[PDB]
Amino acid sequence: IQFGKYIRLSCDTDSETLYDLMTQHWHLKTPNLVISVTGGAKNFALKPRMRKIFSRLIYIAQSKGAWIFTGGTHYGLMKYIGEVVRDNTISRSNVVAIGIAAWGMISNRETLLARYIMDDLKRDPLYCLDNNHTHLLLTTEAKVRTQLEKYISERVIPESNYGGKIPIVCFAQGGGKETLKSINVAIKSKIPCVVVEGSGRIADVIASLVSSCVKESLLRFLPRTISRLSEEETESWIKWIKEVLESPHLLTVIKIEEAGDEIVSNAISFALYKAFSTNEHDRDNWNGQLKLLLEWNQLDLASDEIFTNDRNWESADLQDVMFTALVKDRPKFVRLFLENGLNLRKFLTTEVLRELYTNNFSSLVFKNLQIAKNSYNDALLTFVWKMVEDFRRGRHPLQALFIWSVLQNKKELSKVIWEQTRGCTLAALGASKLLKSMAKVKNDINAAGESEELANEYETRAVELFTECYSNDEDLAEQLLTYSCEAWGGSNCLELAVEARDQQFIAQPGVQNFLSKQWYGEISRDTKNWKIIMCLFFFPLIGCGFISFRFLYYVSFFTSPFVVFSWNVIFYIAFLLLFAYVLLMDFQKEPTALEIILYVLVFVLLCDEVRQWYMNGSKYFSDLWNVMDTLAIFYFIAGIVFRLHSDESSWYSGRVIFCLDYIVFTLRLIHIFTVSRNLGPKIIMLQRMMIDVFFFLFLFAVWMVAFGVARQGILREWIFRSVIYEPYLAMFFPEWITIPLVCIYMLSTNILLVNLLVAMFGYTVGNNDQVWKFQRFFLVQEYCSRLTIPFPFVIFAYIFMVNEILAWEAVMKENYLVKINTKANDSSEEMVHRFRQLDAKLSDLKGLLKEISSKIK
Amino acid sequence: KNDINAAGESEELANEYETRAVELFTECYSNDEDLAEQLLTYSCEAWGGSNCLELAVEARDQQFIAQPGVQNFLSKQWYGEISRDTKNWKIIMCLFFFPLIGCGFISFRFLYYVSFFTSPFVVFSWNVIFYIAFLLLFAYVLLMDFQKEPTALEIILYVLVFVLLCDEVRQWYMNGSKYFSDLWNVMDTLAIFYFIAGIVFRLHSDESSWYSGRVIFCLDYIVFTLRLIHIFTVSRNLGPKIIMLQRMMIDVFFFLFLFAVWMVAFGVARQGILREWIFRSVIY
Amino acid sequence: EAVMKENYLVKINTKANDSSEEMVHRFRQLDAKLSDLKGLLKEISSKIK
Amino acid sequence: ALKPRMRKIFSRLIYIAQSKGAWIFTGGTHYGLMKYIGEVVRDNTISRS
């Protein structure tokens, strides 16, 4: 059909190959089958509540793969049911909406792509077919429908998730004789369950009953119906409601009090559970009721009615029930199976994990791994992309599952498996490092936008766990920082927080105190600053009772990074005073013995820095001031070979290279003074302003070159020696050209002035205690890594080179996990549980008012 | 401003409908990016004859434009058919090296070469590289060449500013006299008009005019470099400093105006204390 | 875009449950439950007198 | 059924038992509560309260 399939049928059709028509020449079979009953009511109060209930129903029908049996006409609900079906195929979350019509009640007919005319819906009582139903089969209709549902309820499937039985549910709302008749043929012919609602005429007369008091409530909800149909038909209606309350287990109500989601999936699953439970051929079966309550998300029904200690499972049979709890993303059920006993390390064999990374790893996330591994590479990503490829080509098993959940952005499933890991403040940072690598991938903003926040949730979990760890024992938490992880990724928690730029983990007072312990070395804090400095100039004051080291005292003093840095600054000044004494009073013609001292004092400055050409990765060359140090030392060695040339034009030029080298050796000392003073909140203002003036001095040099072309082009390989140098030395005819020449200077200034003022203020635009404390931790960490031995005795170390904490961290996790849930009492402060806790207390008053009218009548 | 109460409630109803367009497009972008970006450039069958993207930038709808769906669409537009996540230097090294495009080196998501050289990231990086090579040729001609006649290297410079001229009278379309209130884009015409005025002073055969033709070219070298400095200072401060820039840049144009007004009044006090000549002495 | 509007319009109203968190509907939902107790206390003094 | 509520009640109990210096008489087998009761005891000796 074209406004879709069509089949003409009379009522006495065939023997069940109508279903085999639907599955052999046609679409797939069913794990679920909802039917809808509203009749040909042209009026339908389409409330936004009714819009949610019948949009969740189509969403559930594609979440399970169901058919929907409706009258296939273009009126009200069954028109709206079709529109949510085409809304679902457009949104692409398929769903099959099979329409059941009379063939005698339709408007037009075309017999053979057939064309149908949706002309207009006037006063003619014939019905208009609906345009959005995927299949159409054509109160004539209510036997071929009811015999089909009485077939497929008995159709035994070999898959058999719901005792075989192809789960049927009858979704009912609204009034009319036809919807009250169809609930009867639902319950009484065979027994599929029925769901009713809290709005409608016939829907509320059965919702009120969960006698002639039937008819009392019946004229409450539909009084203008009784005035037309007969009293020999009013007697049948009270009779009809009597055969639906004979089976009160096959009825679930959607009460108006449920003002939220879950409510359509709660009602269908509860109705499917009773029709599984009250069958009683299944009450001994705890396992079929588990997979039924796990395919749906009924956590509370599984906790109350399957794990009771009246049923006796023994938790070793719970293996395949756990695997489907993982791959369907049921985070409440993987938590329920560990709470009721499951050794998750025993369950996670290596072929289960390769069953998870092959079949259950999504190809979109695996596509974003290649855009992460090849474009934004790290030491962790090369480990994890290797670890994914080992499983896909077919030992810490709890972290292979944890990486699997974290990669797929499974937000609540990964937090269940994180509480089972052993190194769990390291798995939280290892997830935060991994997710921040996936958040760099700009192939999808929605995937990267949720891996970015899942990284911030796991950074906050590592903060709150380590704050719990540091508050209990400092010396144990600092062993937990530097734990070498047995190849988690081959990193500490401290390394893995600084690659990820995890500023909240690094700015916390436990980590910042660990670095101050590292920088002071074996010298304690609280001594004083000047108390350590005066022990530098005075050796026997160390052995005196003067510092607090918490001989072996002298080696602990002179290997602390505070002392080594203070020595390397004091020796650098004494190097500069010797470099100034040689350059002025000495330096006659030959390399004097005091200058030979300077030749080895820069060689130990050179070997210290090609040592920093290890731990290198060409990170060192993007530091913008550390490249000055090589080019100060390379300019020194170039000034040595000009000294050993015996020409007075070259010897003097060898001195000039040394005198210009004295400034960059002092500019390094000025740079050391300006960073060590502004270590503190100004280190963000510094080094961002310092790259901002390098851009302004670059643009000033570009303008100074262009000023040279305008200068030399106005006047008369010589050009490079005159277009570059003389504009700086000049800062050391009028045709009418001053009409633009001051407008040159009014445009030269206001592009160099603005670039200067951007440099002063550009640090402000674009948390600033955490932004600082990461960088203060960053800079101090490299010097504590920079060979904490005195500088002239660095060569004597350079050429001489040529799990009970995890048990302790596990008990700190349990104290941390309690402190989350006991703080979620302001969430339980609300009237959620508090509302009908006392309506239970007046139902007890109702339960004792049962006793009163029992004997007064 | 005929009624503040009517205009004060149409202002908030505009902010309610801008927020409705934000939350709907954030719903649209979170479901399918490729469908939401077709929804941006939908030509509306004459709603007003506009996209959602045009209609948000005329209205200065900053909340619709600052959302991550629209900002990602522009970064898709600026990178062109070249994907993101390649690297910055990975695209630059394919400018100097043509066969590195055909190699497995960028990620374009021959037809690869036309998709490379029509992306706005590459065209802008080419137009900066060619602008520097224009300035080095303009410096080589102005110093070593430029003897008396228009040398063949200088004829190259005469057409390289003509393609700079025709590119910009092309920007005298899409124009509305919007282009003339940009305060630095009017420098570019007056750099090119000052160039063409420096051409007709070269073809005059007088040594007082030929030398003055060179002076006009040498003063024109700075505004061609001040444009390059302006290109560098905007492309670096693309980021949160672009509000600090271009508001500070009009603030120094006011200060240099008031400095020039004081420098004129200092000239009257200077020349009035000492002994058509006045305009050549009170200003310069 | 029309089906993305319907998903957006639901997310407005399902987020207006903190507005429905108040005791507006919650106040006499249980006073209805004690009026049912009043409605069955209709039955008691009907026959003691 | 080791609920998180049951986890709090039998972790406070071991915490009370060291806050007072008590003995805890349990069946000494490796099943459920008496397995968990042992684990909070070794959790308490590790945490050293």
Ligand SMILES: CC(C)CCC[C@@H](C)[C@H]1CC[C@H]2[C@@H]3CC=C4C[C@@H](OC(=O)CCC(=O)O)CC[C@]4(C)[C@H]3CC[C@]12C
């Ligand atoms: C006349 C000359 C030869 C003798 C003067 C001695 C100073 C040049 C020396 C001795 C004390 C030194 C200072 C000792 C303590 C300070 C603060 C100190 O602060 C920190 O540790 C940074 C805080 C942090 O890392 O978290 C860093 C070294 C510094 C700048 C040192 C810089 C150079 C100083 C001033």
Ligand SMILES: CC(C)CCC[C@@H](C)[C@H]1CC[C@H]2[C@@H]3CC=C4C[C@@H](OC(=O)CCC(=O)O)CC[C@]4(C)[C@H]3CC[C@]12C
């Ligand atoms: C010695 C000369 C002849 C060769 C030096 C080459 C540079 C002059 C060229 C090649 C790389 C170019 C850059 C390539 C990438 C950057 C950053 C790029 O950043 C953006 O795309 C802005 C962000 C945004 O629009 O959202 C803008 C172009 C820019 C400044 C280009 C400016 C000029 C550059 C430095």
Ligand SMILES: FC(F)(F)c1ccccc1-c1cc(C(F)(F)F)c2[nH]c(C3=NOC4(CCCCC4)C3)nc2c1
């Ligand atoms: F001081 C400082 F920045 F506040 C600082 C403060 C706190 C901790 C460490 C440092 C620091 C940082 C660096 C840098 F980050 F820059 F690498 C340093 N570099 C040197 C040099 N000593 O010899 C050299 C100088 C002479 C030429 C050869 C190399 C380098 N000392 C440093 C101390």
Ligand SMILES: FC(F)(F)c1ccccc1-c1cc(C(F)(F)F)c2[nH]c(C3=NOC4(CCCCC4)C3)nc2c1
């Ligand atoms: F670079 C820039 F601003 F950071 C920028 C960054 C990002 C995107 C675009 C631009 C940009 C903006 C403009 C402006 F907004 F100013 F129009 C540009 N104008 C030019 C010129 N090329 O030739 C001309 C120079 C020589 C004289 C004739 C005209 C103009 N390039 C631009 C690039």
Ligand SMILES: CCCCCCCCCCC
């Ligand atoms: C921040 C304390 C700085 C004290 C410097 C003391 C200098 C001692 C010099 C001894 C010769």
Ligand SMILES: CCCCCCCCCCC
């Ligand atoms: C050609 C001179 C134009 C006026 C220069 C004033 C600039 C003052 C800058 C102070 C930072």
Ligand SMILES: CCCCCCCCCCC
């Ligand atoms: C922001 C990345 C800038 C990289 C510039 C690379 C320059 C390549 C020059 C090749 C001759």
Ligand code: NA
């Ligand atoms: Na200037």
Ligand code: NA
């Ligand atoms: Na200036």
